[PDB]
Structure formats: C-alpha cells, structure tokens
Amino acid sequence: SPWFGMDIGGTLVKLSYFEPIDITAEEEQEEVESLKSIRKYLTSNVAYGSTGIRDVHLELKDLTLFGRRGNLHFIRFPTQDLPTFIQMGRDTVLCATGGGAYKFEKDFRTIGNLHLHKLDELDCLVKGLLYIDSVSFNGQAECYYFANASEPERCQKMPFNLDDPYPLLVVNIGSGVSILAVHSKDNYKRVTGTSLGGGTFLGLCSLLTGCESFEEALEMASKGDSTQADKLVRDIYGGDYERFGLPGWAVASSFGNMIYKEKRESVSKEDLARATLVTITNNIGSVARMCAVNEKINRVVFVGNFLRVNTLSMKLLAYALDYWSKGQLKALFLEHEGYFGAVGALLGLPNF
Amino acid sequence: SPWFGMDIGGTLVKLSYFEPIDITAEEEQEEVESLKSIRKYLTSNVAYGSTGIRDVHLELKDLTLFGRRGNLHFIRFPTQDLPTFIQMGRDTVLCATGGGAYKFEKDFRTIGNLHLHKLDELDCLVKGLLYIDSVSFNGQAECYYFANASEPERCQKMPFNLDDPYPLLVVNIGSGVSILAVHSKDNYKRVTGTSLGGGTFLGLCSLLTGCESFEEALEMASKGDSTQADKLVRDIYGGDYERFGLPGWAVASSFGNMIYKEKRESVSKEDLARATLVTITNNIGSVARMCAVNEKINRVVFVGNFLRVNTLSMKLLAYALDYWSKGQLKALFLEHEGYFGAVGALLGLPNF
Ligand SMILES: Nc1ncnc2c1ncn2[C@@H]1O[C@H](COP(=O)(O)OP(=O)(O)NP(=O)(O)O)[C@@H](O)[C@H]1O
Ligand SMILES: Nc1ncnc2c1ncn2[C@@H]1O[C@H](COP(=O)(O)OP(=O)(O)NP(=O)(O)O)[C@@H](O)[C@H]1O
Ligand SMILES: CC(C)c1ccc(CC(=O)N2CCN(c3ccc(C#N)cn3)CC2)cc1
Ligand SMILES: CC(C)c1ccc(CC(=O)N2CCN(c3ccc(C#N)cn3)CC2)cc1
Ligand SMILES: [Mg+2]
Ligand SMILES: [Mg+2]
C-alpha cells in the first residue's frame, strides 16, 4: 500500500505522498506491478491529467518517516476533478480529511477493498504544521516573516523560529477562513471563522472581471489601483481623522466609490480585481487581529492556498497586522501553506 | 438664528432642526422675513429640491430644548448634493459633525458671517443617542429588539429599556463601520472599525446588478436566494460539521459558488443582491460579536442608515447575533437610526 495523505477541501484536493527511497532487492521483487506503476507515474510526471500539479519545489527529500527513508511529495488538483481521480483509481488504506472526506466517502468506497479513515480537518492541520516545522524544509526554516514590513525599501523575507510554537494563532485561508488558537500539541480550539476567504476573492473577481483562474485574478490585481473603487478616509474627511488615529489612506468603505455611476464607468477590471483582493485580505487580517487580542496570542500564522503565489496578500497582511497592532503582532507564513492537512492525515496512518 | 444640527457623512447629510412652537406676539414681529421663510419652507414641504427628504414619522413633538417648546425635525439628502444646499444658503451658527464638517469647512464659510463649529463625529453620536433615548420617541421607546429572533413564527419587534445604558456597544453602520464601547456618558472609545459597510453593499450591488438606488437593491435582495452564490457548509461536508458546531446552512464561503462558470451563468441579479446583503450583514454582526466579547459588553446597538427601511438586515443581525453567541448577546435597534450625530451636534450649541 502506498502512503497517501489527502485533504479534500471545498475547492482543492491536497495530497501528500511518501516515496520510499530505501527499497531493497527483495522488496522490489515483492512489489506488485500496479504499485511500481503508481510510484513511477507520480515521480516521473509533474502534471497529472489536465489539472493535477505536483509542487516539486516543496518536496522534502531524505525524510525518515515510519522508520523508512523517503521523499515527501506535494500534489494538488481541483475538487471538481475528484471523480476523475476516483475513476483512475478504479482501473490501500486512505487517511482523508477536509469536508470532502465525508461528502465523498461513498465514492471512495467504489474502489474495492479500499479502507477510508476520516480524520478531523483542523486536527490534521495542527499535526501537519507542527511536524513540517519540526523536520524543517530540507534544513531551511519552514516559517518566515517579512522584516520591517512597514518600510517597503527594507521589507524582505526572513526566516522565523518556531521551536517552541505555543501559543499560536493559525489563520487557515481556504474557501472560507478558520481561526485556531493552538495552546499545546493536544490543546487547541477553533476560535471562530469568517466566510470571506479565498472563494470570495475568486468568486467576486470572476463576477467583476471575467477572470478564468486564480492566477489570472492575481495578475489583474497586480496592475490595478484599488483606490479607484474604494472610498478612503481622506475622501470623507479631506485628510487624516486624527482624533481616532485613522490615516487618510486607510479604506473607510470598500467598493464605496462604486456608488457613483461615473466612477463605475471609469473603473477598470484590474482596479476591481485589486479592490477585491485588498478587501478580502484586510478583513482577514482585521479578524485575525481581533482574535489575537482576545486569545492573548501575539504569533499569527497564515496558511491555506489563498496565499500561494500571492505575495501581494502576504505583504498586505504583514504591513496591516504590524501597523494596526502597533508592532505587537507578527504576521508569520509557512512554505507549505496549503498542505498541512494532507500531511496530518498521512501521520494518522499508524493508528490503523 | 435657526437651530440646526448637521452630520455630513461620506454618503448622506443628516440634519436635525428644532422648530419653535411657542413663538409669542413680540417674537413674531422681531422675526426677519428670511427666518420666517426658512421655517415655512421646512415645515410646509416634505421633499426639498429633488433629493432632500424630511422623515416626518421620526419627528419629536412638543420637545423642551434650551428652555423652549418645539418640534425636532429630521432631514436627509445626499452629500453629493451639498453644493446645492450651500448655494441655496447663499441666496447663523452651524454645529457640524462627520467627516464632511472638515472636508467642506471652506465651502460653508462662503455663506457670509456664518459661524461653523466642528464637533467630533463619534462624540455627537453618543450624546445624540443618549439624549433621544432619554426624552423617548413621543412617549414610546426609542430602543427595540426582536424577541425570539431564532424562531420566525415568534420573531416580532419589542421595545427595550435603556434607562441605565452603560455599558453599551454601538455599531455605527454608515459608509464604513465604526464600533464604540460606551462605558459612561463621558467615557467611551472607538474599539475598531471595518470597511465593509453600507457603501460596500451599495457599491458592489451596483456593480453586480446595475441597481440605481439603495431601496432598489433592497427590493432585489428580498426576491433573491443568496445560496445560489454562496457556498454553504453542507456544500463542502455534505451536511453539518458537528465537531465544531457548524450547521450545514452556515455560509462557508461568501460568493464561493461563483468560482464555477456554470453557476455564474445561472445566478440572477436578485440572488447576487441578496448575497451581497447577507455577506455584509453577517460580517458586521460577526465583528460586533468579537468586539462585544473583548469589551465584555452584552448589549450591542446598531445604528447608521444601512439599516433604514432594511428589516432584512435587522432580522439577520438579530438572528445571527443571538445564534452565534448562544443567547448571550442581544441585538438592539433605535428608531432614529441615522440621525444621532446631527442631534448631538445640535446639542453642542450652548457651548458657543
Ligand atoms: N489553482 C488554484 N485553483 C483554485 N483556487 C486556488 C488555486 N491556487 C490558489 N487558490 C486559492 O486557494 C483557495 C482555496 O485554498 P484551500 O486551502 O485549498 O481551500 P480548501 O481546503 O479547498 N476549501 P476549505 O473546505 O474551506 O478548506 C481558493 O479559494 C483560491 O483563492
Ligand atoms: N437614500 C439613501 N441613499 C444612500 N444610501 C442610503 C440611503 N438610505 C440608506 N442608505 C444606506 O446608508 C449608508 C450610509 O449611512 P450613513 O450612516 O448616513 O453613512 P454616512 O454617515 O453618510 N458615511 P460615514 O462618513 O461613514 O459616517 C449607505 O451606504 C447605504 O447603504
Ligand atoms: C469614521 C468612518 C469614516 C470610518 C473610518 C474607517 C473605517 C475602517 C476602519 O476603521 N479600519 C479599517 C480596517 N482596519 C484594519 C485593516 C487591517 C488590519 C490587519 N491585519 C487591521 N485593521 C481597522 C480600521 C470605518 C469607518
Ligand atoms: C471549515 C470551513 C469549511 C469553514 C466553515 C465555516 C466558515 C465560516 C464560519 O466559521 N462562520 C460564519 C460566520 N459566523 C458568524 C456570522 C454572523 C455572526 C453574527 N452576529 C457571527 N458569526 C461565524 C462562523 C469558514 C470556514
Ligand atoms: Mg482546507
Ligand atoms: Mg455617519
């Protein structure tokens, strides 16, 4: 049986796969050809079908897991294409997490003799996050922050140490947003959540701009000016609102300038894409800040695939969290952003 | 000099006007004709120009203020039309608040010999709110809640007593959102705010549906089905997420179903209008709940003109705040929702 970990979310399926690299002579002979064929298919291709992608740059090499040396691979594809994955599989013990482990439980059992073990979404997230950080990213730090995020001339990616991680606030930006307070390896709760996450950015941006992919919406947002759509504090006061420390550049009303017909007619798609990203990102950071104050936690780590190849949101979160907390909260990020549930599911394998 | 109070916000100008009803014989003769003309223009018309509206139903009659009996009138018009108001005025001491008191200060001084006194936006809000509640709404309660908001068969408007108001959380839903913790009549702070307020609803709904007015967007939203655009918990899990008490009907990702091209092509404008309202309203209630927990305040009062003629948002806030706090927080509303700053400004008149 191959060692898989699967996180089936609302938008993306994430898969962690452990490739043994210490296969002896007798072990190779005992291999069934279908197992040799699966391992060869996964390691010789980086694109699977039309929508499966292996993130090669995230691979953990020479990892000791369950007493064996191997490489840990990270693979993703849209949940919309899970029926194709299952039909491929019908041509093994599967630890699965995310909402789709329950929604698609009966579909996985169409694969004969397959043993599906459902694991809690946020239980695997914590276990996966603490494991990857503990084994490091091939000797490098798994966690990083943006030093001097208030100054763009100095704002640069710098590694961050989480050797004693607790207490920790985890902000999981997937389709929606889950916010976790991690007090120890076995003591953690879901503080709250918000429904304004990656799916809101993607869904709204698709309505407003007609973009056809997450990467395309990010590309449009990088060329736009969100202030063409948003109403700023200085549009209401003429400048700063000194009494309550609100700078003129702060957004008073997201999309607030779109109440005027002439401004809707002069706004571009790139402006709307950017305003969507800024609106979603600032609201996530603001909610994260409120939970951090309530939980008395000053380390806020952001995960989930809303932030993959999305440096704009990361810098925005880094600047905003630092500015609005007056340097008392630090925005932290992790190289394996969206795969921690898949890893945590894989780690539940010995329990069966 | 007529007694005006003016709150010039980002979207709407609010005006409170005190009409003396105890004018003696000698007082009437000493009246200048322009003062008789202004008083007659305001009390004999309910529509001023093309965009000014007097909310007759809110009028406080036989009010004793500054030692005189009179009626308190409530008038509104768009800030976009303030130049017309000023040009009418150029054909008096003015206490003004809101961001526009600073942005348009030089324009008000084009009226000769006019004395403009700027007052803090949230200072007038608190003073105005506590005053209107103290004098009551013509013998009726100014404050009301929705009893049994969890059950639609019993959900009905019921008056609420605020005779000892403190402590109080005030959630001012204007263009953006301001959240205030009121600890006493002179001790209060702005806890935080969010940029997802009435202007976001109006601005986004205009982009998505082409609606031309706030009332039209509310009319569209009442006919729509927000679940056509939003991704629910049961769309991800297949049902409830029992582990963390998330019901299947809860919104996991606002506009999250708009990532699929076929769902964008079958969604209606009414659905998008409703999803915009639900998204904005739930986020406001969720932020209000987080501030209430942090401030240890269980009375949350919502004001601002996002909720005028908007019972859908009020019931939504009443149900959501009660559900997610398990009955520990009460959503409260006030009949004079958007006029408290204008009233508070009027009350600063003796200080000059
Ligand atoms: N290739 C991609 N396709 C789709 N969305 C992408 C892609 N890359 C990044 N994203 C973003 O990542 C978000 C989903 O991230 P992810 O953490 O995988 O959520 P999820 O687990 O699938 N949904 P959830 O059930 O809430 O956990 C989307 O809403 C997008 O904003
Ligand atoms: N006739 C109307 N015209 C415009 N907006 C309306 C109207 N009726 C209700 N609204 C809503 O009320 C919101 C503005 O309420 P209001 O409390 O007056 O904010 P404001 O003071 O003008 N802006 P702010 O500077 O943030 O205080 C708008 O964003 C709409 O959602
Ligand atoms: C007074 C009226 C006009 C008004 C002004 C401003 C606002 C909005 C507001 O007050 N703010 C914006 C959002 N802010 C953030 C943003 C990101 C992070 C992080 N990480 C934390 N906070 C808080 C302040 C409404 C109405
Ligand atoms: C686990 C993933 C799929 C997920 C589920 C759910 C959510 C959203 C969420 O968790 N919630 C919705 C917003 N909620 C509100 C709404 C109104 C009020 C008030 N007044 C208070 N809370 C909190 C819970 C994200 C990701
Ligand atoms: Mg997920
Ligand atoms: Mg206002």
From Swiss-Prot, chains A, B:
Functional description taken from the UniProt entry: Catalyzes the phosphorylation of pantothenate to generate 4'-phosphopantothenate in the first and rate-determining step of coenzyme A (CoA) synthesis.
Family matches, as InterPro entries: ATPase_NBD, Type_II_PanK
Source organism: Homo sapiens (Human)
Catalytic reactions on record: (R)-pantothenate + ATP = (R)-4'-phosphopantothenate + ADP + H(+)
Entry's family note: Belongs to the type II pantothenate kinase family.
EC number: 2.7.1.33
Gene name of this polypeptide: PANK3
Location(s), subcellular: Cytoplasm
Summary of activators and inhibitors of this protein: Subject to allosteric regulation, exists in two distinct conformational states, a catalytically incompetent (or open) conformation stabilized by the binding of acetyl(acyl)-CoA, and a catalytically competent (or closed) conformation stabilized by ATP-binding. Inhibited by acetyl-CoA and its thioesters which act as allosteric inhibitors and compete with the ATP-binding site. Inhibited by sulfonylureas and thiazolidinediones. Activated by oleoylethanolamide, palmitoyl-carnitine and oleoyl-carnitine.
Name this polypeptide is given: Pantothenate kinase 3
Keywords of this entry: ATP-binding, Coenzyme A biosynthesis, Cytoplasm, Kinase, Nucleotide-binding, Transferase
Subunit structure: Homodimer.
Active-site residues (renumbered): 121
GO biological process: coenzyme A biosynthetic process; phosphorylation
Enzyme class: transferase
Tissue: Highly expressed in the liver.
Main location: cytoplasm
SUPFAM superfamilies: Actin-like ATPase domain
Effect ascribed to mutating residue 250 to F: Loss of catalytic activity but can bind ATP normally
GO-annotated molecular function: acetyl-CoA binding; ATP binding; pantothenate kinase activity; protein homodimerization activity; vitamin binding
Residues engaged in binding acetyl-CoA: 175, 178, 190
